[PDB]
Design a binder for this molecule. Structure first.
Ligand SMILES: *[C@@H]1O[C@H](CO)[C@@H](O[C@@H]2O[C@H](CO)[C@@H](O[C@@H]3O[C@H](CO)[C@@H](O)[C@H](O)[C@@H]3O)[C@H](O)[C@H]2NC(C)=O)[C@H](O)[C@H]1NC(C)=O
Ligand SMILES: *[C@@H]1O[C@H](CO)[C@@H](O[C@@H]2O[C@H](CO)[C@@H](O)[C@H](O)[C@H]2NC(C)=O)[C@H](O)[C@H]1NC(C)=O
Ligand SMILES: *[C@@H]1O[C@H](CO)[C@@H](O[C@@H]2O[C@H](CO)[C@@H](O)[C@H](O)[C@H]2NC(C)=O)[C@H](O)[C@H]1NC(C)=O
Ligand SMILES: *[C@@H]1O[C@H](CO)[C@@H](O)[C@H](O)[C@H]1NC(C)=O
Ligand SMILES: [Cl-]
Ligand SMILES: [Cl-]
Lengths: 129, 129
């Protein structure tokens, strides 16, 4: 009879398109989601439909990427409102009294190319008034 | 003779309605599309039919707005399937085993007001079974 629905993972997704049923011996190859990277590069991540008609056990193979850390602009400050620079986080820029924020005040950690995250915007500056 | 077809832009559209033909000296003012915002606010964006009957050079002036970042619901997870919270992306909500999803499982980053994007739905929760 075989294996039906593959489990959903935190950090991975099926590499290709899933079919309705799987028979013993067939495998689904997984790959990191957007914004995640391999825990151990080169490691092949796969589920196998087994003879006892179960899905085999697959350890989570990927981890959330991080954007580069960010310095305070001169005469102002960057706030890691989400507690980190992990993918899917944002940062808030503010300026000190007497200064005016020139540029973007919120920046987002996003996928830049297939491999890599980056901040959506450059840092602003704090200009004197 | 004059200038005929103004180029269509990635991030901008003409502010008003276009006429069949333009003469040298006339200008078409551009504005951000729905779901975009100025790259450098204040900067006036316009094409001008020049005297050499060409359209002037206009850099792309706007950039895709972003929706606010999203936290994983307790006992579950939000998946930025498109790699960002940019206008016109979606996120998927999933719950851990033992938990069911109470609410909407897909949220879309949409235009909310003239200036503004927001998610189409509030986050669901994950409740025990
Ligand atoms: C954001 O990511 C979502 C999820 O991956 C994208 O939507 C998905 O788009 C794929 C195509 O890339 C759709 O696949 C299609 O499946 C149908 C049958 O399901 C098939 O007839 C087609 O030939 C095609 O293979 C998929 O259904 C769709 N999934 C969902 C949940 O909407 C979306 O395109 C991405 N958005 C942006 C802005 O990049
Ligand atoms: C289905 O068969 C597989 C064997 O291919 C079982 O996996 C093994 O299970 C034992 C006991 O749980 C472990 O000590 C081994 O390390 C497992 N091997 C592998 C490769 O995973 C699996 O438990 C079986 N499942 C059911 C429901 O019968
Ligand atoms: C990162 O932190 C921001 C700021 O606290 C979170 O965005 C706020 O979320 C609250 C609800 O928790 C909303 O009421 C606000 O509208 C959001 N603020 C802004 C400026 O949009 C965001 O959810 C957090 N992101 C992650 C990934 O945890
Ligand atoms: C047209 O004239 C402008 C100067 O107003 C010049 O910058 C542009 O390169 C010219 N282009 C052509 C095709 O003649
Ligand atoms: Cl810091
Ligand atoms: Cl996240």
């Amino acid at each position: 009879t075989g294996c039906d629905d593959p489990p959903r993972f935190v950090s991975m997704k099926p590499q290709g398109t899933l079919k309705p049923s799987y028979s013993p011996g067939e495998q689904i190859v997984y790959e990191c989601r957007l914004g995640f990277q391999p825990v151990t590069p080169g490691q092949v991540l796969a589920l196998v439909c087994q003879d006892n008609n179960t899905w085999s056990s697959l350890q989570e193979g990927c981890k959330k990427r991080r954007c580069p850390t960010l310095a305070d602009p001169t005469n102002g400050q960057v706030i890691l409102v989400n507690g980190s620079t992990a993918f899917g986080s944002e940062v808030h820029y503010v300026c000190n009294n007497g200064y005016y924020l020139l540029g973007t005040n919120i920046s987002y950690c996003e996928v830049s190319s297939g491999t890599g995250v980056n901040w959506s915007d450059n840092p602003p500056t704090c200009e004197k008034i």
